[PDB]
Design a protein around this ligand. Structure first.
Ligand SMILES: NC(=O)c1ccc[n+]([C@@H]2O[C@H](COP(=O)([O-])OP(=O)(O)OC[C@H]3O[C@@H](n4cnc5c(N)ncnc54)[C@H](O)[C@@H]3O)[C@@H](O)[C@H]2O)c1
Ligand SMILES: NC(=O)c1ccc[n+]([C@@H]2O[C@H](COP(=O)([O-])OP(=O)(O)OC[C@H]3O[C@@H](n4cnc5c(N)ncnc54)[C@H](O)[C@@H]3O)[C@@H](O)[C@H]2O)c1
Ligand SMILES: NC(=O)c1ccc[n+]([C@@H]2O[C@H](COP(=O)([O-])OP(=O)(O)OC[C@H]3O[C@@H](n4cnc5c(N)ncnc54)[C@H](O)[C@@H]3O)[C@@H](O)[C@H]2O)c1
Lengths: 562, 562, 562
């Protein structure tokens, strides 16, 4: 049921088609004369915008162009996004979305998403009621505090949820109606933004008192009051500590998951399973040394332990295979540095040497896998890579810190200081590495877009209210299952991004099959086959006919005379 | 979220308040000057319309007035309807709605409901898409073929679903948004309507070919395609044969129930349980003789047998206690008249006398309960009542045929030809009976409004897709449980209509508790207590504040100079 | 009366304010949360967009930016346009609008204006009825056939009326509601546009049959049928012959004027009056030699003759002072080349030498003023300029052909081959000229924006139905009257563009005072002072308060009890 006609129909991106309005539905809907005479298809529109896009050279001009397309016509926007997804995820999402936020601030002409300020505390529900859309299933919330590679940006961080929500629809098929980007702005610590008179938000510094926590609680309550307790809420580019503690707080009472703790863990585990298929030995035979003992490292280690346990190994024996190296030093029993409750499982009896630097820890533990999530910088020194290559026939090196400037090492050093026998994976993109021997090795990129769209779609479709830790184990197994035998022969650890739209759906299916198996899905009746269930509820970018049904009634009896 | 402002806000019955618009929300919403200066409450509005209504004397003038109120303001309409519900159900619903349809045709100024003609076959889905409301949970469908007491009325029967849907909201609390009245018009057999030039529908006779069945199938498919497979669809005032066979056809694949077969059975069973509490002996000790062997009689008998079985009695022993008397004669094994499959359970070894008339059957079977659902007329002859009073100390007489002109007997003859020891219940309303002895006996009225609102609410809230036969057994038990000890002492078989709005809710709770117990509810998580679950989802007729939230921001830092 | 609320209010450029929405009218209108928290004024918005605009370097990027601003917020767009009008007329209008049309085709996201194709013939009125705005006073029509400096562009020429209509509001103050840009597309002769599959119009060549004339007549009739007989209609960038003959055809029955024939004539006459104030001798003492005998030359000559006549000189004596030099040769009586009716007034008895080239004509006629409107190219050869400087103490040279590539000469040659005593004026912009002597001469630019906004405003305000030839004489006198004594001392022939918004208004006043004096104004009662009349009806770009009037009623008597 479309209730619009004429010019309003073309001012709504949801119902706009541009020139794809056929002649008969131009004439019946009152659009004749308001559009140029040509009748086009969506293929022609997509081709026009694709070549206009190839003519452009900077990523940021491409970003402005493609978001303008999103604002004028959303079906065409998502068709263009799905057509060339590998080349446009770096544009629509990180890293270009952060540059767009930093430099052009708020490009958008239309109001996309809510702005909730600390000045609105006690009245968040009215702000949420101002949003026209009545059914939203996914909410992405930003603080602006930690933009990836840009730092604090305040209100300008609003472009980060928007872009991310695009991926929700471009890869998973979540309806754009059902997505709400939110910016919780509590001030900014960026003095550059506090000095200029054209900053678009509060001119105070970040509120770090109890008012911030109360505002977050009130916003969560308002969102789930209007939209339901099973609304998926993601905290995107919050402060690191804030994001971690909010994930702990709202994990049980709300449907939230984190990409930094849970998505990164799932992607790292998928890479590890791919590596265990590439190399002869399984994941249980590995010995993992972590660089960093934060909550992202703990999430990855817990997921690895769950994977080890499900393969027949005991929990304690699994945890004895993971070693974690803090900034202070190796986590061992009896060290003078403070160790909290969550690092207790991975605190082990100290080795004889008691290493003080990371390279010494690599030499003394002889670990097969090395995983860097510290985020400090180039902590994977060349000596570390050389020691890894010497100890292991085929070392597994994971530099999961992002952006590139914060990665533990780059693919070039990893693949050169080794003879190419290392299985290197990184969060940040890297170019293929060519050696003097003549071979070319492409490093697997642990993109978070592998996990969160499929998991979000499965959670939204199944009416899940609590996203557990084993959902991401199932997602990691599903992601690994997408790799073919020839891909493993070529040494790829992840499926190519070019078919993410397929991979995501497959992931969703597996997660769906898990959620109904573990009674964490509240959408009944339970579908007989989950694949056909999820594949008919994804959003299609094909235009819908707006043509009124005009037909002739069969002739009936004549009306009687008066 | 209200998206309207100014005059449109007062032209929508859903958002209109009339003078209950407070001054501040008159000024903020642009209604100042468009309303008379007085500020009123809903109590004052209800009082004004109540006395204007008492001034009126004919039921039909009252009907026109109250439907005008519904068209201008729906919250006030339902508040007035709930305030005096016992006196306004006869006005909003049968019998006055049939008189309104017959005489004033289509009173309504607003479009309420869909008109689907046989001329629209093959294009029903477009008609359904023309309905603005996106979520409807209850659909009431009429043919116009059998209006209760009026006969065929064609398109003019459209007023029957409308009125019935009012009860859905007045007693059960179903949202008026979620209700859709439909008229399937396939012509009329009423020659008076075929002769006048101002009849509002097709001027053909009723289509009784396969096109009618195909149209009904297409309409069912279109409704459940747009609104979901668990949409509740009720066929109201269809032809008797058509309604029965459509109930059989769509019982399994759609969420449908019938008031004539299932609601009448539930009400009769509730009366029988009340009578078993009034008299010493239980329902199993009774011997039931039915007048009529149709599908309504079979539904009542099957529900009675289920009730007998659940109380410890065997199924065959239960069915041996019900005797059914057809027009041809008593259903016995070996009679020359044809007996179909559904009457096989209640076909018994013939008694010695083999009675040929109904009064002889009463004399020879000595039945404690007598139930008339034949619909022929005054078949409960005075000799039948006298025989019942002589055989039984306290006979139970049920004249469930309606309207009054088709009832098997009236309360006056039943209570006079007996000394007042009969427990008489009838579908049609009757006045209290006073005898020369001085006592006054009020006959229990088996109103269908007891069952269908509560059952409809429980089915809608639980996302049920198939309404079984034991749902109505649970509803009958719930209805009987509403009677207090003093009410049973006074001889009432049904709770008073004056608190139907309460009774219905209680019925809903029980049905809800049944549906979750038998895994026929698909709304999860399952509520811990069903009473609080259903009582917070019913529709309240209290006005909602439209006042925008206006507040002052706390003072923050000054904007920097340029 | 604003009937919108919430998000629609910000999706309408007419009512959108962006952050200029005050807090109280954010909260009352349902915009809270949909806008960033900052409250801004229009000054802050204008400053932000001004510096964002200075950061840009190419004119075309500036065009895209400023038209995006127009699409999101029109009051801010016109405030920015009026703030820096001298630097943004070259961007909003020619020459940058033609480059935008050629290269980016149709930038616009919103539907601005109507597209009427030859395929819609016989149904133009329905297309006109599709336009939402009910009162439009000015219509600018384009063919796309002759874009200034770009040639045929077909449908892509639609950007030319749009830009021109901006000037209508930026200089004159005509309401943007009242403006309708139209593109009559009858095919294109541009083979580049006929080859590519992404051209936005008909893929046929230009229809030059009677169907084109019939389409133009039908469009004129439809526009004046919907909007009134006094609707101002301007044919913009039509074919040269088509524009001239359409001006002749519709001059009497419609309210049309032409910028090429009438605006150019008015601007040239204003320059000539300024020159007659700069030099001692008046316009009657001059002898004018024209280069070109087209209809633009004839319009300029007729306006010059009218100006000469109104100063006491006879008509025949006035026409004997203008000489016109065709491509074939000097217009003289008895030449073998064909001379039509309109060149008869300026065909004179041949001089003795009978010159064959233009330089010889300059030598033999000794003309004080030289005016080039041929449009061929650099026909003002250096010998012509040298002869002009030798014959006249202060020659007047007018190179009114545009663009620069078609100008008869450039300011540098004109001011250098003379010692700086020439009064050079050109249609196309030129840079200031510096000589070795050290002086700097700025050439007066005969911009058409001097005349058409003020004349259009005066015609629209006075309800004029026929724009005569003396309206432009009055406009030329008004334009000349804007020059101060010091400006004439410095040698300027036209008022600076930086205050066009003022000059236009003054022109309007004079034209208004003329129209009421000659009974060509149909808006009555006639205003006592025309200045205050026109200055209170111009459109102001200041934001209008949307705040609902909220107040407290004085306490009155209490409502009585029931
Ligand atoms: N033209 C339209 O706007 C249009 C047309 C048809 C249906 N719908 C919508 O379809 C919905 C029907 O719901 P259902 O019974 O199929 O739910 P469902 O049982 O199939 O799935 C369960 C939950 O998942 C949600 N969901 C389903 N698909 C989704 C998707 N691609 N993206 C995000 N969320 C999704 C659903 O809203 C629902 O809450 C209606 O709410 C209706 O508004 C809209
Ligand atoms: N101003 C408004 O219009 C407004 C305000 C609040 C909520 N709502 C509506 O509330 C609904 C929320 O659904 P829910 O999660 O509470 O479903 P639910 O889980 O509580 O109940 C299950 C089913 O029963 C339906 N239902 C619930 N109450 C009903 C009633 N009184 N009458 C008829 N049907 C009823 C529901 O639509 C749902 O399909 C939204 O669809 C939303 O449109 C509307
Ligand atoms: N919020 C609004 O939209 C709003 C508010 C106030 C007035 N108006 C408009 O003002 C108009 C009143 O007309 P009037 O009696 O003052 O005419 P008028 O007598 O003052 O002028 C005569 C003609 O010139 C037109 N005109 C006047 N000013 C114009 C301008 N700046 N630009 C273009 N055309 C102009 C007029 O529409 C009229 O047709 C109403 O049509 C009404 O729609 C609109």
């Amino acid at each position: 049921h479309i209730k619009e006609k004429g010019k309003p129909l073309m001012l709504n991106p949801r119902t706009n088609k541009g020139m794809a309005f056929t002649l008969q539905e131009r004439q019946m809907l009152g659009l004749q004369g308001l559009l140029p005479p040509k009748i086009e298809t969506q293929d022609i529109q997509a081709l026009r915008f694709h070549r206009n896009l190839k003519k452009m050279t900077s990523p940021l001009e491409k970003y402005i162009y493609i978001m303008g397309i999103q604002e004028r016509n959303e079906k065409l926007f998502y068709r263009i996004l799905q057509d060339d997804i590998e080349s446009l995820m770096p544009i629509v999402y990180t890293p270009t979305v952060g540059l767009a936020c930093s430099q052009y601030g708020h490009i958008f002409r239309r109001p996309k998403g809510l702005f909730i300020s600390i000045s609105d505390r006690g009245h968040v529900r009215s702000i949420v009621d101002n949003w026209p859309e009545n059914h939203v299933k996914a909410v992405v919330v930003t603080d602006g505090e930690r933009i990836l590679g840009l730092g604090d940006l305040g209100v300008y961080g609003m472009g980060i949820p928007v872009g991310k929500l695009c991926l929700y629809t471009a890869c998973a098929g979540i309806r754009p109606d059902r997505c709400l980007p939110v910016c919780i702005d509590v001030g900014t610590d960026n003095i550059a933004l506090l000095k200029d008179p054209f900053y678009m938000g509060l001119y105070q510094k970040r509120d770090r008192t109890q008012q911030y926590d109360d505002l977050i609680d009130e916003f969560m309550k308002a969102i789930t009051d209007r939209y339901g307790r099973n609304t998926l809420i993601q905290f995107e580019d919050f402060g690191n500590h804030n994001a971690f503690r909010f994930l702990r707080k709202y994990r049980e009472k709300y449907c939230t998951f984190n990409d930094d703790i849970q998505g990164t863990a799932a992607v790292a585990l998928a890479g590890l399973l791919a590596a265990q298929k590439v190399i002869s030995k399984p994941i249980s035979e590995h010995k993992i040394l972590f660089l960093g003992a934060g909550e992202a490292a703990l999430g990855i280690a817990n997921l690895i332990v769950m994977s080890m346990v499900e393969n027949g190994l005991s929990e304690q024996e699994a945890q004895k295979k993971i070693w974690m190296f803090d900034k202070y030093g190796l986590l061992v029993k009896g060290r003078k540095a403070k160790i909290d409750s969550y690092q207790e499982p991975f605190t082990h009896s100290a080795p004889e040497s008691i290493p003080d630097t990371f390279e010494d820890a690599v030499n003394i533990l002889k670990p097969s896998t090395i995983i860097g999530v510290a985020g400090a910088g180039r902590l994977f020194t060349p000596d570390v890579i050389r020691a890894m290559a010497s100890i292991n026939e085929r070392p597994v090196i994971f530099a999961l810190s992002n952006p590139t400037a914060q990665a533990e090492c780059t693919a070039e050093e990893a693949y050169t200081l080794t003879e190419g026998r290392c299985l290197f994976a990184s969060g940040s993109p890297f170019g293929p590495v060519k050696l003097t021997d003549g071979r070319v090795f492409t490093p697997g990129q642990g993109n978070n877009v592998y996990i969160f769209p499929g998991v979000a779609l499965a959670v939204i479709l199944c009416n899940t209210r609590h996203i557990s830790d084993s959902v991401f184990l199932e997602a990691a197994k599903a992601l690994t299952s997408q790799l073919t035998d020839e891909e493993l022969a070529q040494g790829r650890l992840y499926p190519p991004l070019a078919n993410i739209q397929e991979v995501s759906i497959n992931i969703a299916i597996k997660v769906t099959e898990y959620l109904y198996a573990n009674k964490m899905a509240f959408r009944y009746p339970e579908p007989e086959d989950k694949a056909k269930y999820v594949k008919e509820r994804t959003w299609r970018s094909e235009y819908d006919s707006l043509l009124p049904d005009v037909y002739e009634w069969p002739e009936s009896a004549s009306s009687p005379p008066v």
